[PDB]
Design an enzyme around this catalytic site. Structure first.
Site, short mmCIF file in Angstrom:
data_model
loop_
_atom_site.label_atom_id
_atom_site.label_comp_id
_atom_site.label_asym_id
_atom_site.label_seq_id
_atom_site.Cartn_x
_atom_site.Cartn_y
_atom_site.Cartn_z
N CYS A 108 -30.10 1.81 20.07
CA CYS A 108 -28.95 1.29 20.84
C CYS A 108 -28.84 -0.25 20.90
O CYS A 108 -29.60 -0.92 21.62
CB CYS A 108 -28.97 1.83 22.28
SG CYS A 108 -27.55 1.26 23.29
N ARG A 111 -28.13 -2.52 24.62
CA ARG A 111 -29.06 -2.46 25.74
C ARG A 111 -29.17 -3.73 26.58
O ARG A 111 -30.07 -3.84 27.41
CB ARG A 111 -30.45 -2.10 25.25
CG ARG A 111 -30.55 -0.69 24.71
CD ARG A 111 -31.92 -0.44 24.12
NE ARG A 111 -32.04 -0.94 22.75
CZ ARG A 111 -33.21 -1.14 22.11
NH1 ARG A 111 -34.35 -0.89 22.74
NH2 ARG A 111 -33.23 -1.58 20.86
N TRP A 280 -19.35 1.99 26.36
CA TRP A 280 -18.10 1.71 25.67
C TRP A 280 -18.37 1.45 24.18
O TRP A 280 -19.50 1.14 23.79
CB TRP A 280 -17.37 0.52 26.30
CG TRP A 280 -18.20 -0.72 26.46
CD1 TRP A 280 -18.47 -1.67 25.50
CD2 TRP A 280 -18.84 -1.17 27.66
NE1 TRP A 280 -19.25 -2.67 26.04
CE2 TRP A 280 -19.49 -2.39 27.37
CE3 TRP A 280 -18.96 -0.64 28.95
CZ2 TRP A 280 -20.23 -3.09 28.32
CZ3 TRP A 280 -19.68 -1.34 29.89
CH2 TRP A 280 -20.31 -2.55 29.58
N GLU A 285 -18.17 1.44 15.17
CA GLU A 285 -18.30 2.89 15.33
C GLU A 285 -17.01 3.65 15.01
O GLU A 285 -17.05 4.69 14.37
CB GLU A 285 -18.71 3.24 16.75
CG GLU A 285 -20.16 3.02 17.06
CD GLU A 285 -20.48 3.50 18.46
OE1 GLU A 285 -20.78 4.71 18.61
OE2 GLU A 285 -20.39 2.68 19.39
C1 HEM Z 1 -22.28 0.02 27.33
C2 HEM Z 1 -22.04 -0.19 26.02
C3 HEM Z 1 -22.84 0.45 24.87
C4 HEM Z 1 -22.69 0.13 23.58
C5 HEM Z 1 -21.72 -0.93 23.01
C6 HEM Z 1 -23.61 0.94 22.80
C7 HEM Z 1 -23.77 0.92 21.44
C8 HEM Z 1 -24.48 1.84 20.70
C9 HEM Z 1 -24.33 2.09 19.29
C10 HEM Z 1 -23.33 1.38 18.35
C11 HEM Z 1 -25.19 3.03 18.94
C12 HEM Z 1 -25.32 3.60 17.51
C13 HEM Z 1 -24.55 4.91 17.56
C14 HEM Z 1 -24.28 5.48 16.20
O1 HEM Z 1 -24.19 4.67 15.25
O2 HEM Z 1 -24.15 6.72 16.10
C15 HEM Z 1 -25.93 3.44 20.12
C16 HEM Z 1 -26.93 4.39 20.20
C17 HEM Z 1 -27.57 4.89 21.33
N1 HEM Z 1 -27.22 4.57 22.64
FE1 HEM Z 1 -25.99 2.93 23.11
N2 HEM Z 1 -24.32 1.75 23.67
C18 HEM Z 1 -23.86 1.49 24.95
C19 HEM Z 1 -24.32 2.12 26.09
C20 HEM Z 1 -25.28 3.11 26.16
C21 HEM Z 1 -25.56 3.91 27.34
C22 HEM Z 1 -24.78 3.77 28.67
C23 HEM Z 1 -26.55 4.76 27.03
C24 HEM Z 1 -27.25 5.80 27.93
C25 HEM Z 1 -27.48 5.55 29.22
C26 HEM Z 1 -26.94 4.50 25.65
C27 HEM Z 1 -27.93 5.15 24.95
C28 HEM Z 1 -28.03 5.23 23.57
C29 HEM Z 1 -28.99 6.03 22.84
C30 HEM Z 1 -30.10 6.93 23.40
C31 HEM Z 1 -28.70 5.80 21.36
C32 HEM Z 1 -29.48 6.46 20.20
C33 HEM Z 1 -28.67 7.68 19.76
C34 HEM Z 1 -29.29 8.26 18.51
O3 HEM Z 1 -30.55 8.24 18.40
O4 HEM Z 1 -28.53 8.75 17.64
N3 HEM Z 1 -26.14 3.50 25.15
N4 HEM Z 1 -25.47 2.68 21.17
C1 LIG Z 2 -27.30 10.78 14.54
N1 LIG Z 2 -25.88 10.36 14.47
C2 LIG Z 2 -25.05 11.31 15.23
C3 LIG Z 2 -25.46 11.30 16.68
C4 LIG Z 2 -26.07 12.42 17.24
C5 LIG Z 2 -26.45 12.43 18.57
C6 LIG Z 2 -27.00 13.48 19.07
N2 LIG Z 2 -27.52 14.42 19.49
C7 LIG Z 2 -26.23 11.30 19.36
C8 LIG Z 2 -25.61 10.18 18.81
O1 LIG Z 2 -25.40 9.09 19.61
C9 LIG Z 2 -24.55 8.02 19.20
C10 LIG Z 2 -24.24 7.16 20.40
C11 LIG Z 2 -24.98 7.29 21.57
C12 LIG Z 2 -24.67 6.50 22.68
C13 LIG Z 2 -23.62 5.58 22.62
C14 LIG Z 2 -23.30 4.79 23.72
C15 LIG Z 2 -22.24 3.90 23.60
C16 LIG Z 2 -21.54 3.80 22.41
N3 LIG Z 2 -20.50 2.93 22.27
N4 LIG Z 2 -21.87 4.59 21.37
C17 LIG Z 2 -22.89 5.47 21.45
C18 LIG Z 2 -23.18 6.25 20.35
C19 LIG Z 2 -25.23 10.17 17.47
#
Ligand code: HEM
Ligand SMILES: CNCc1cc(C#N)cc(OCc2ccc3ccc(N)nc3c2)c1
Ligand code: HEM
Ligand SMILES: CNCc1cc(C#N)cc(OCc2ccc3ccc(N)nc3c2)c1
Ligand SMILES: C[C@H](O)[C@H](O)[C@H]1CNc2nc(N)[nH]c(=O)c2N1
Ligand SMILES: C[C@H](O)[C@H](O)[C@H]1CNc2nc(N)[nH]c(=O)c2N1
Ligand SMILES: [Gd]
Ligand SMILES: [Gd]
Ligand SMILES: [Zn+2]
Lengths: 404, 402
Positions: A108, A111, A280, A285
């Site tokens: 993420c 963060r 958001w 994305e």
């Molecule tokens: C507030 C603005 C936020 C932005 C701009 C953001 C941005 C991102 C982005 C771009 C990704 C990559 C997702 C992808 O390419 O599929 C990601 C992954 C992730 N986000 Fe964030 N995020 C935000 C908030 C949060 C929040 C609120 C949470 C949970 C409380 C969170 C937890 C996670 C987790 C656990 C991943 C890993 C998901 C995976 O392993 O596929 N994020 N985030």
């Molecule tokens: C492995 N790629 C597909 C995928 C699978 C899962 C699951 N299960 C979660 C995923 O999370 C993406 C994600 C998680 C949290 C986010 C928070 C904010 C944001 N703008 N995008 C965010 C995008 C993605």
């Protein structure tokens, strides 16, 4: 302790936090598997050990390790597990736990916001009907008329000896994918099996390319029940380009609230299978991955034809010219619709700020390079030239098998 | 349980069985991944020699033969006798190619079979070194129709120092330190530029002055050599439709010739073995021209493009970048100098992975290096899971001789 260099600046830091990594990763000295998406898989003796470290981590966070409250709270969790085989988190701990899971999330880039997170406590929930109401409060709060607010909603912890709370949709808002006679897909090809499962459980399908799915919600040991989202709760942004007037006519849309709902939340050895969280969008994305992946909406070529690009030859860099304007269209549209969105440059620079913050506070930050670097303009962002260390800390968000 | 590897655009799944034969260890553990880091006796020398000889004799489908077995005997016999051994000409050629083949961070490996190997293992001095290097540069450059080559100088040996090329490439531009902290030319070569001057070089004052070579023969200080200007082919950078771009005075050289890496073959080490291919345009337009610590023209360009540079959401960086890459490709094609764009590159590398799965049951590949520094997910290598590990023969990094 791993040495880490920023090659843009020349600075050097040591990641001492890695040393406290709980679970083992996919990599070994003889091969690196850092690029795999899902690697590998998916007793009070142990549960107590995870409870203790979390508790310690909590009082540490609040300047109170070794205190009266700490000693008392450690004995309390132990007595509870002894009696029941599990324990209950105090609300404050749950809040902390949710924030730590977000903070510890290697993939993420967002963060910097980890400290600012609204936590809804649905541990008293036990029907599927107002599991849905709980979700509606979330979506409403977090959308907030487009001024987006990070939130998570925690449903009851899994109990051995009767089933889990699950949300069958991977996001609270996703677009339908209809299998066709060709084998092709109208809508979103990512969401084809869930579209299938929606119909089999009763949903009467739509016609178009952007039909918001219905939620498949499952209470313990019951089969999933389908609900429909009130259209006024599902805020969407019509896509338009600030100078290319034809772009709007493509009729592309995307929704405002990215809300992931199929990941398991883990705090102190407690496991929460249903816990939707949302922040958001980062425009890349939507604009790059969602609209331009060949296995998603795959619009890239269409946009290029419209721009009268030379698609005869890769080296016109048409794919690249078109991708950028799609991203431009997303940021412009979202800003016009007064919906919170961040661009990949603003986003990555704050994540740098976050790495520095994290250094002083915990002596490092778990970060997966491939997931932090944006899918366009990678090296134009500062995170590209930054060495990262990927490892697993608890509390965490973990993938889980799909309930079917 | 060999690694399971997936392509996420198509759905293909393969198992990298080759990875189990990884000869060395990398920086990673179960506790932590360090995959994004840039820089992570007779019995022992024998067992590598033995494994390389076995490699060779398999590729010529002669494994288990008595040419195979006797070669092993004389390798073990020559190590006993003189603490080392020599490669046959044929083996040297096999070994240099395999090294390219095994290099995880190279996207251009589809071409690995077509590599011209120049044997300079009889080289005797820096002057001869220079001659050998010039002919490489003339053969590889080929008036614009570039050819893959490697010139292999004498292996490391006891009782005698190394052959070394002090420059990181045969062709680089100087960077002159100004005392604003400011740098004229390419800042990545500030160090090599003063070394040159300290060894008696009259510098320039341009942004694109080709550096002399600093060549080291055993037990000898380095010796300065000027490349004949008519050998260093360069390309003036203009843009198909941005005519003011030409007025930036920008150029880049035809031939990417890395010269500071160590070629290791069967336990033998070749500290001086300059190799070369042809450019992928992102190396020039994105990294060398846009990195803030390199030429750093991005904002200059955006400002001329009349882009709005006061806000990031206008995506000025991305647009100016794409146009610098268009201008690179266009200039090189105009000047009839070989160059490959990042879509064609990654496409052909996908083929290479397919060839390699059939051939050795896998392929080492460093995802973070295989994905272009612009437009990652636009390319097919982005969606492809990869397994990164070390096979021998190989190209290794090595310390700077100073
Ligand atoms: C507030 C603005 C936020 C932005 C701009 C953001 C941005 C991102 C982005 C771009 C990704 C990559 C997702 C992808 O390419 O599929 C990601 C992954 C992730 N986000 Fe964030 N995020 C935000 C908030 C949060 C929040 C609120 C949470 C949970 C409380 C969170 C937890 C996670 C987790 C656990 C991943 C890993 C998901 C995976 O392993 O596929 N994020 N985030
Ligand atoms: C492995 N790629 C597909 C995928 C699978 C899962 C699951 N299960 C979660 C995923 O999370 C993406 C994600 C998680 C949290 C986010 C928070 C904010 C944001 N703008 N995008 C965010 C995008 C993605
Ligand atoms: C023929 C056309 C070739 C192309 C298009 C190509 C492309 C590339 C690119 C883009 C990189 C990454 C560069 C960087 O970002 O630093 C790379 C790395 C590399 N290449 Fe190739 N290459 C070619 C030929 C060769 C040849 C002929 C050899 C050796 C015989 C070779 C060996 C290597 C090695 C060892 C690396 C890794 C460098 C490092 O780890 O620092 N390449 N290649
Ligand atoms: C890891 N730090 C960056 C780096 C270090 C070294 C060294 N020593 C060489 C490097 O050269 C990369 C390279 C190697 C061979 C190439 C062949 C062709 C081509 N177009 N680019 C090519 C680029 C890069
Ligand atoms: C194979 C490769 O690891 C895979 O496509 C990853 C690469 N990096 C990514 N990075 C982000 N942020 N999101 C993704 O879905 C992916 N996909
Ligand atoms: C820290 C990071 O590993 C480093 O900047 C890498 C990232 N990926 C790269 N990929 C390529 N092809 N070339 C590079 O120089 C780099 N730099
Ligand atoms: Gd038109
Ligand atoms: Gd023009
Ligand atoms: Zn790793």
């Amino acid at each position: 302790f791993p040495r880490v260099k920023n090659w843009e600046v020349g600075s050097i830091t040591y990641d001492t936090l890695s040393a406290q990594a709980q679970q083992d990763g996919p990599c070994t000295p003889r091969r690196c598997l850092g690029s795999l998406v899902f690697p590998r898989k998916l007793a009070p003796e142990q549960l107590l050990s995870q409870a203790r470290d979390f508790i310690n981590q909590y009082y540490s966070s609040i300047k109170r390790s070794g205190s009266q409250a700490h000693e008392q709270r450690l004995q309390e969790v132990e007595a509870e597990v002894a009696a029941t085989g599990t324990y209950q988190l105090r609300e404050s701990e749950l809040v902390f736990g949710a924030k730590q899971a977000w903070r510890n999330a290697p993939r993420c880039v967002g963060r910097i916001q980890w400290g600012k997170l609204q936590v809804f406590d649905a541990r008293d929930c036990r029907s599927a009907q107002e599991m849905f109401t709980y979700i509606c409060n979330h979506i409403k709060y977090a959308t907030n008329r487009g001024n987006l607010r990070s939130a998570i909603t925690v449903f009851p912890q899994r109990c051995p000896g009767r089933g889990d709370f699950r949300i069958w949709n991977s996001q609270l808002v996703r677009y339908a994918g209809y299998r066709q006679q060709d084998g092709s897909v109208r809508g979103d090809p990512a969401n084809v099996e869930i579209t299938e499962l929606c119909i089999q459980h009763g949903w009467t399908p739509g016609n178009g390319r952007f039909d918001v799915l219905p939620l498949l919600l499952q209470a313990p040991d019951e089969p999933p029940e389908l609900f429909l989202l009130p259209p006024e709760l599902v805020l969407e942004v019509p896509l338009e380009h600030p100078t290319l007037e034809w772009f709007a006519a493509l009729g592309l849309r995307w929704y405002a609230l990215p809300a992931v709902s199929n990941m398991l939340l883990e705090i102190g050895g407690l496991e929460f299978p249903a816990a939707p969280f949302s922040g958001w969008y980062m425009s890349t994305e939507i604009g790059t991955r969602n609209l331009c992946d060949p296995h998603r909406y795959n619009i890239l070529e269409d946009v290029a034809v419209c721009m009268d690009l030379d698609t005869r030859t890769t080296s016109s860099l048409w794919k690249d010219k078109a991708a950028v304007e799609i991203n431009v269209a997303v940021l412009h549209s979202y800003q016009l619709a007064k919906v919170t969105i961040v661009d990949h440059h603003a986003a990555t620079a704050s994540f740098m700020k976050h790495l520095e913050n994290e250094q002083k506070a915990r002596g490092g930050c778990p970060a997966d390079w491939a997931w932090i670097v944006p899918p366009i303009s990678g090296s134009l962002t500062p995170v590209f030239h930054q060495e990262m260390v990927n490892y697993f800390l608890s509390p965490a968000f973990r993938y889980q098998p799909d309930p079917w």
